[PDB]
């Protein structure tokens, strides 16, 4: 097999939902309160949510 | 983790039954990516056998 990947869907100071594509053995999970970065400083500026 | 993990009716059926135990863990803080844990490719172990 080979693991099919999707880019993370990120919303800053917001919330998201799950959209099931019904592809085989689909796994979708949502985690809140992250602090992601990119090269030119933090990707966003929120602290929570 | 063994034979039968991926089941497609033929070479170009464009559909498949998957039983491979994809379990999603939490990503690293301050890092954008999608880590995962699952069983090994059963074909690998069988062709080892």
């Amino acid at each position, epitope marked *: 097999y080979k693991t099919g990947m999707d880019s993370p869907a990120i919303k800053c100071c917001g919330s998201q939902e799950c959209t099931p594509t019904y592809r085989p053995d689909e796994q979708c999970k949502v985690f809140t309160g992250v*602090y992601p970065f990119m090269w030119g*400083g933090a990707y966003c500026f929120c602290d929570t949510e | 983790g063994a034979f039968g993990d991926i089941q497609s009716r033929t070479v170009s059926s464009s559909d498949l039954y998957a039983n491979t135990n994809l379990v999603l863990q939490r990503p*690293k*803080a301050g*890092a954008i990516h999608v880590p995962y844990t699952q069983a090994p490719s059963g074909f690998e172990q069988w062709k080892k056998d």
Partner: nanobody
Amino acid sequence: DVQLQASGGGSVQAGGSLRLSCVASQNLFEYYTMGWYRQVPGSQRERVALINNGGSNVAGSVEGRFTISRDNAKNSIYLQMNNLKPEDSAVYYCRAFGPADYWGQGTQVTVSS
């Protein structure tokens, strides 16, 4: 419960230097982003610097004078203050943010002209 114990605060003069140190009761940095927040008496807590595996970002008020470093093995984070000015006096709390949020009890920092 996980506890953040801050130390290194004290009394100094203008132009002096200090090094704060916050130590966590458990190995938590590998999953958390560490932060230092200052609170002037009567003011809201405001961020000083943040650090995680992606690097460190320091507040623009104290750019080039406050620098934050991390040490996962010792479970310690250090904030080296240099060239302090009278307005820097405040209670500094270390914050560990992740799935859960924990706030340090804080230490008093006083700097005199």
